[model samples]
Target: ESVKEFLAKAKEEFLKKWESPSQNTAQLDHFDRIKTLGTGSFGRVMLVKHKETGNHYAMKILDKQKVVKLKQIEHTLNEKRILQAVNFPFLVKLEFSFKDNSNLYMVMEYVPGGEMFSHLRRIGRFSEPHARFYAAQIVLTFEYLHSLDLIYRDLKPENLLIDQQGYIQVTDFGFAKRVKGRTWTLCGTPEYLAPEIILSKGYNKAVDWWALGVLIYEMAAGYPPFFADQPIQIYEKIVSGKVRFPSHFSSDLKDLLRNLLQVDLTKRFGNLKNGVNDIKNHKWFATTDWIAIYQRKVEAPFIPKFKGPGDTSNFDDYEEEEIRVSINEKCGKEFTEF
Candidate 1:
């Protein structure tokens, strides 16, 4: 079948399979939902205090029926596997994943400091040194992730949360994928989506580099290079790199930004090597302390102390039966063969 035909068929299968009611966890009524933290098209986020431990956790409850209806089970599973694969401080950790016949509960480390986007929007923009700090941390995390053959297809400020010490805690891996050679899908936020992807051309992990460029630009300038009022207009500019920088930007900063924002996929960083080590060596990160970052020696810009996962004192008595899945079943497609 043609590409369009295949996608249509897959979508049909997804819709048909998703129409069935979602399965839910047995502990659904056990914890007290303090308040709704956020909401997305797929589901709602709730702030809950654990019944027994009194630990606080952010629970992302995905409507199984909706996931199946949208044919996003694969995407959901991929996100879970990627999180399970990498255990890093900069990357958000998945503490638990549970499923019942109708729903899915993905428990993750809750970043009490809120989103990076809020900080950016409130401050308007960041200084070069500050931007580089956050940028470096994110780059290191990406380096580790890509080394494992993982591609974080979506990279945007909104997906990042600020830890107490102001460290960038990367979250939301729902669209992440593991691939070889190349894979193309028309996805990702309009502002951060790479040109090749916007043009309907195939792309590899290098597309992530393009997104990094966009992110750095946004950090320094407070707005994306192509922030149009309309999504189509934004797409047009991103495909063409219609960006402008302030006169205050130094020439070296300009050069680095130019190289990063370049549309030539062949000339971009990682040209000869497998991924973006070239970027790690870029002058932008020249002042970084690699050893300190790797050793977790540097103090995070912000550090938040959360009260573990649940507040049992305020929770109702919840009887949670052990819900377990075999490692193979738990890993799904990400399961490896020895």
Candidate 2:
């Protein structure tokens, strides 16, 4: 299809997305905020239960004033657009989105299973089989996003959540962008930031593969390879750093991680001649059945312990203070969508 035709189709789909049942205008009083799930620079996420249906959800309330203050209007809108555009098992599903007078609300499926970071921290690290399972699922998510020309710049344990079934769901799309070619955006966690991004050099989806390597290494070893107390020193180590493997690490895993962490974009596993297929075909993932993994036929190594959908024990305790920020009409108008 021509560029015009592609965009036209996209526009049509986007319009259809708003017609979905979840796009209904929601009021703050429609649901009861149970507790705070997590907090970030954007705002905090609340565990809410619908009064009528009793269905639980993670309501992400973004303070419009704070968003405008941080100059993240474009990023915030892009995140909503992307979330509305895609729906897959590995990626978090945005169930409903609406705005009140003060904050923009995004209601999403609340996975009872907690963040992967918590599990990793508790268990110290994962065995090869466990890491392979999670990594395989994450790889497919990247494949889907890259197919749509979207690059997920953020790939870390904190952003990855586990569901009751033990499958992974990737959240927080603030840094995800749809890029046709290279994009020079210096944004991402300092530890997971790709070398090209740090150098201010334009980069493509391959940056995600580099992060995947970092993620895999961290999961297998319990800590990121490039560790420094200061951000500058971390970047320094990333640019010209040597990754040392534990004595017990397998050769196949080492080879895969080394290729993925390659500094040269030309030789990077994802950017190489065969693309993501090369990474999938690596010996370390030899037993992975891509179709089965997508079908969820492979059982996860560890399933999170939770009573039911409303369980909040897996999450950390957060303050229950009421946040009052006056809405900025100018900023609200920019994101107007009933």
Candidate 3:
């Protein structure tokens, strides 16, 4: 089938399967916990393999006690729902979700190439072409999420995992929110914050465009445009609306960055009359083949070597977590859907 036909069929099949996953729901003991992948605020992230299929998955376990103590009940539930609701090539997929006496478990597809943060740090910066490849993928990502009225507030290398094919798989939906009009929450990393978010004015999806600018700059320059040792200092720089591009940057790239980082939503590229088209049609992306990029026909800039789907070499080692205490019924009610 052609790319267009393939996509249509894929979406159809996914909806059919996910909508009725209850019939063959996954259970905790159904997987063999292989090793610890990483640790987070909630609990441990483990590399597990399904007993029947023998396929690798990332199992995210969240302790009910920590979630209730941290007052993250709503956010935790949203993360699971959002993951189950969205289905796209660049976004992370939740294979299955279930709960037990002490914790909630989210089984997700394992992306073997590891975090983009590690790759970026190992080699200071990516060239314009390399950055363009990744940036194009993100544009498609944002375009899809915005259409669904979802805002992925967290935009950082650490949240972006690379598959063995080198394509991006955006993970960590803890900060992702769904909004139809506007949300006033102060969310996002300090360096990636838009002026509106910092100023406490209500912000819309346009804040994501500003983040794209910051991400592009960081990819090419090896650091975010607004750099500060302190969070307050970073906020000051963001509201000041000052930025300096590296001398080596291409003229078209600079123009795209400037347009994306605009403080005013009226002048922002993605928020303009044409919406995301204004970005897709930008001069910097003139040579981009949007069709090929989305279909995975384009060659990736870098592909990491992995022994197999279960390879954990690219991921950092972390200590295993033990569920400390049992939770009360109060917290259990919040995650009844899990």
Candidate 4:
């Protein structure tokens, strides 16, 4: 079946996610503040606890009016929509999200594992086997996502979280788009942006594969293939799609990496010719357990041992929340019916 069919099934299962929460089961008031985790451009994330359930959760609070002013309603909605449709162990889960007059509340599963970007910076780089394992898990995640006709246009080090058990938790769907046709959107981080997107030409799921190659290269190497101070220079390098592996990279890993970074969209990874299966069968993933990985049976290598939840006293170096606005205003009048 095509990606459209997968999306149809997802839509049916996640009907409440079309707009707002249907059950409204979130206990907003009872959540205890364990500590502040971090913040984004428009929101702040807190590590909180459910007083009744005693369960820990990561709560992202975004200013409602600011999002509207920034015209990010579409992108904001896109993140929730995709998160609701797909449920996987490797992906960060959004349990429930709601909006009041002043703000929007996004309650997600609290993963204690730290950010992958920090780990890479602290250690410099990951071993070949470790990189391969992470890439293998991400490949399956992308396969499932693409099958649903969802284009995860953003995939970078910052978007990946390494759990205490070492499972790669793919986070951030802000740049995700529902690929109806040949979608042409010039969005995504500079380092991971695909060539077609930079050219303002139509792009599809293949862009994810290209980013996959970039992610692999960055994890194996120190930096992205295209690194320039000027935006024009960066775009030029990205469109050129020339990836150079570090000397530490193995021959097998280099070959797979090159194929994934193909600049031509038609030849990009994930095609029927050299698709997900091809990557899975590569020598790099020789020791991976296909079923265990898909089922998340293998414990993550780096699961965070949070002092329960929302304990940010130790992670004082996290992000700061600059803008805090609430989203209480109603959307189109049609939403009032609900």
Candidate 5:
């Protein structure tokens, strides 16, 4: 059977997961705050230890005030919704979410290996073999998300965390949306923005595939194909739709990228008549074992060292801020959801 047919069956099983009721959920008191993971415009991510279970989790603390003021209420709610709907190895698992008088807390499994950003940059770029390994995982991630008709509008190294076992855990679903057809939101990073998004053309899941192309290129070449002094310049370069490949890129790798980076929907790898198979069956992925990769049976190319469970070494330090109660809590009558 084809991958599409298999996904058709898997979607039902995954949707059934939504019907399973949550039990013995966590609250703010359940976790002991360990250290700050990273700070953001709205709030910060913290590494916290579960007092009862002793397991570690990354706690996302978002100030309801900042979230509302930034007009991110719907995206925050949508993120929580998408996180609960997904269950896959590459996608980070959401333990639970709660709200106190201060902030909205989203506790997720602590993928101790840290962001792929630092690792990728530290090594300058990955070897062709290593690039394929990481890119394959992303391909599987896209497969699962697309099957559910969800568009992962954001895909980047910073948003991908490495697990102790060395595989990636896709995080930060703030831009994820359930789109049965097309959406016209001009969201996502500038370097990775697809042409359709830059042009205000209605876009679909294919945008993610376009980002995947940029991601693969970045992993292999150490930088994106399109670059400039500013976002506007970068947009023009992307709209130009010209890619310059370094001579070191292998023949098959270059061909795969050229196909993936196409501007036309009919010409793109994932949106073709044969579906994702167009990319999966390409010569570059000829030796890939899709099932083994999905099952994580294939050994990861790089496994980061760690001290122990809940080790925060891989993450960067942030300014310590007391998890304070939000002044907006008293008037946040519409913030009951999340």
Candidate 6:
């Protein structure tokens, strides 16, 4: 064929495939709902099985009306975009996303080992090596996301999932933002929220590192450094830089935690001149093989046992709830295309 004719044909074929919904990767009916995995203000996640392949997946059902009402349309869309953009072992990827009249659907990899919170609860606190293992993975996750100019504002035990392989996979991008410099957003769990976020001072990826320090402390000590009956009190403690460490905590662990939990951004471990390497090179993680952690070759300290793919034993019991929002004008035509 002539060069001009061949180029024209290729363009026509590309446009056809792009516009065809059937040619898309996933459909709602492609999976059968097994059980409710989780529930929240956005929507609920359900355990599902692909009809043909029989592979289990987590289906996130989002309410379009609620999202629009809350003015979180951009944040909702950003989560999908970021998940699709990222393809790292420690970060959750978006396999398929589609939308109907009332709701938007996102199909993701179903991690059977369950939440790290569940494991932490059952085992009390982890040993130094055990905490280091998970902390290393989380550090790499921050490195990858920050490299892409994305900031994961939400970093808590509940957001960290232990995959079937016993590796940590960071999930939930509802508060994630792709910022070049700083973003002024008062969002994130109070206990894990960085001092800058609470003060309404514009913040960047450093906040994630701060949260990571909190996570490490929780893993090593069984709870967050600062806690109170109210979120206001937690914020007060965080801003005051008052943290109570367990008597049994090691000096190396305490040093690393102090650097991470430092209220001043200038002296924070990950925010220092050396950047994330400061955290990676800390004495607490001296035994960590970062390359192996990124490759997912390192054996997890605690691996949850599962009979097979359909196991729900690892997760907590959740009530059966179906979200059906009225498709009003607020739902908008833009939502239907997703």
In model 3, the worst 10-residue window by lDDT is 15-24
**TM-score of each candidate structure, all chains considered together:** 0.80, 0.92, 0.91, 0.86, 0.94, 0.90
lDDT of 5 by residue, 1-338 (tens): 67768788768876775456343257888889999988988878899988998999999988887888888887877787778768887998999987777687789888888999989988999898888888888888888898898899889889999888888899899889878989987789999888999999999989999999999999999999999989999998888868999999999999999888998755788987776778888898887898898888988888988998878888888888898775545425645655
Supply the global lDDT for candidate 5.
0.85
Q: Using TM-score as the measure, what is the rank order of every candidate, best first?
A: 5, 2, 3, 6, 4, 1
Ranking by lDDT: 2, 5, 3, 6, 4, 1
Q: For model 4, state the Cα shift of residue 330 in Å.
A: 7.2
Residue-wise C-alpha lDDT for candidate 6, range 1-338, written one tens digit per residue: 44347435544543453345321368777888899989988688999999999998888888887788777787777677666656678887678887766787788888888899999998899998888898998887887777667899999999999987888888888888778899997888999999999999989989999999999999999999989999999999999977889988999999999999999987898988888889888888888888788777888786789888889888888998865645554476656445
Give candidate 3's total backbone clashes.
0
- TM-score, model 2 to reference: 0.92
Question: Candidate 5, which segments miss by more than 4 Å at Cα?
Answer: 2-6, 17-24, 327-333
lDDT of each: 0.69, 0.85, 0.84, 0.73, 0.85, 0.83
Candidate 4 Cα lDDT to native = 0.73
Clashing pairs in 2: none
lDDT of 2 by residue, 1-338 (tens): 54347445655664465345344556678899899999987788999999999999998888887888887777777777778777667998988888766777888889889999999999999999999999999998887777677888989999899998899999888888878888987889999988899999989998999999999999999999899999999999888847889877899999999999988878889997788889899999999998799889888897899999999999999889685545545365767653
Question: How well is each residue in 1-338 modelled by candidate 4, as lDDT tens digits?
Answer: 55458656755665445455343446467677666777766667788788888888877776655666766677777776667656766889988766555666678887676677877877788887777778888888887777667888889988787765678888778788777677876788888888888888877788888899889888888677788998889888777756566788899888888778888777765865756777788787788887788767876544555564445433446544433333445453322222
Q: In candidate 6, where is summed lDDT lowest over 10 consecutive residues?
A: 14-23
Clashing pairs in 3: none
List where candidate 4 sits over 4 angstroms from the true fold.
1-23, 299-307, 313-338
